Amino acid sequence: GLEVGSLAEVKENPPFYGVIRWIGQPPGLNEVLAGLELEDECAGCTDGTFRGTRYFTCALKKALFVKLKSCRPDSRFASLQPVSNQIERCNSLAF
Amino acid sequence: SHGLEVGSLAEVKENPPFYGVIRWIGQPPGLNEVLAGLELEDECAGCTDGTFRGTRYFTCALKKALFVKLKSCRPDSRFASLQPVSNQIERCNS
Amino acid sequence: MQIFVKTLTGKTITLEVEPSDTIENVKAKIQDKEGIPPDQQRLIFAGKQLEDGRTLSDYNIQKESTLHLVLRLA
Amino acid sequence: MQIFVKTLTGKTITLEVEPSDTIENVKAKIQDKEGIPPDQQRLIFAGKQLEDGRTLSDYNIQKESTLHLVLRL
């Protein structure tokens, strides 16, 4: 479940966290990329460009382009608990 | 020569292809495939106005939203070789 | 309709909202109830960051949904 | 800045625009210059169809860039 707006984590040491700002397949590449906006600057980050072409705009050195298949829904936020369950939701559907 | 992203003029790989503009790209919950939501050039009975499995991902006119695997798409070859009035390399005149 | 807003520390508040309310509207309601400035608020639902000019309806946020509030305290 | 708009027949108009110009404003300028109703204009740049509510800067259009104009039939 990865769309523009998704909080994503990149598996690494340490894992990067960011928000997906762009999904697409640049010319020459055989797989779909996500453009992430990171919280902090990174070496090798751009401001929204990939191989010279701009795909979105963010702060300097905060854009990271990664294969979508290498992103996962951010595990930290996936772990937060709703106030109301699906059991309660099912109950609401009936009464 | 410009790849595929939201806004790209695309053709779906069929014989003959049909054409649409990519309005949304994403992998919906419960799918392990990246989809393109297309706005078709011409109405199609049954097509939605931008919804997929009950979720709205963009708004088109009724009958012209179609969701396909991005891998089923390529740049619209009708417009992929349009030429500019001027080009950067021409500045060189020695 | 009622939604919940839960801080990362688990403070929970109820809000009365409408599907047509904007995210910016929801942040103003949180400011009014809890005192948190809206420009400090980062609202998360279903794994996505909610952007200011979209509506709750746009994200298909239903009655009794829980939004999570991360503060940009920097 | 100055941009070009070129139809599929080579007919070309030159427009003075700002990067902040919306695509709809560009379409209105095209109608003023050549009389083509905006609803018929498909503006294309870098393989993409330009949408009314975005700006030229949203598409990284440059000085002397060429937008292509395809008419809906």
Numbering used by the authors:
A (entry chain B): 469 to 563
B (entry chain D): 467 to 560
C (entry chain A): 1 to 74
D (entry chain C): 1 to 73
Quote what the paper states about this structure.
The deubiquitinase CYLD in complex with SPATA2 is recruited to receptor signaling complexes by the ubiquitin ligase LUBAC and regulates Met1- and Lys63-linked polyubiquitin and receptor signaling outcomes. Upstream of its C-terminal catalytic domain, CYLD harbors three cytoskeleton-associated protein glycine-rich (CAP-Gly1/2/3) domains, which are ∼70-aa SRC homology 3 (SH3)-fold protein interaction domains known to bind to microtubules (Yan et al., 2015). Here, we report that the CAP-Gly2 and CAP-Gly3 of CYLD are novel UBDs and demonstrate that CAP-Gly3 is indispensable for full CYLD catalytic activity in vitro and for CYLD-regulated NOD2 signaling in cells. CAP-Gly domains comprise a five-strand β sheet topology and show similarities to SH3 domains; a subset of SH3 domains binds Ub (Stamenova et al., 2007).
A detailed understanding of how CYLD CAP-Gly domains bind Ub came from two crystal structures of the CAP-Gly3 domain bound to Ub determined at 1.7 and 1.9 Å resolution. To obtain crystals, we slightly extended the CAP-Gly domains C-terminally; crystal form 1 (aa 467–552, 1.7 Å) crystallized in the tetragonal space group P41212 and crystal form 2 (aa 467–565, 1.9 Å) crystallized in the orthorhombic space group P212121. Also, the Ub binding mode between the two structures is highly similar, with hydrophobic CAP-Gly3 residues Leu475 and Val487 engaging the Ile44 patch of Ub. In addition, hydrogen bonds are formed between CAP-Gly3 Arg488 and Glu507 with Ub Glu51 and Arg42, respectively. Interestingly, the extended C terminus of CAP-Gly3 (from aa 542–565) adopts two short helices, and Phe545 from helix1 forms further hydrophobic interactions with Ub Ile44. Chemical shift perturbation mapping of CAP-Gly3 bound to 3-fold molar excess of Ub revealed a comparable Ub interface in solution studies as compared to the crystal structures. CAP-Gly3 uses a central Leu residue, Leu475, and an extended C terminus with hydrophobic residues to bind the Ub Ile44 patch. Mutation of Leu475 to either Pro (as in non-Ub binding CAP-Gly1) but also Arg (representative of CAP-Gly2 and most other CAP-Gly domains) abrogated Ub binding without significantly perturbing the structure of the CAP-Gly domain. The chemical shift perturbations within labeled CAP-Gly3 upon NEMO binding mapped to a separate highly conserved surface, revealing that NEMO and Ub interactions are independent of one another.
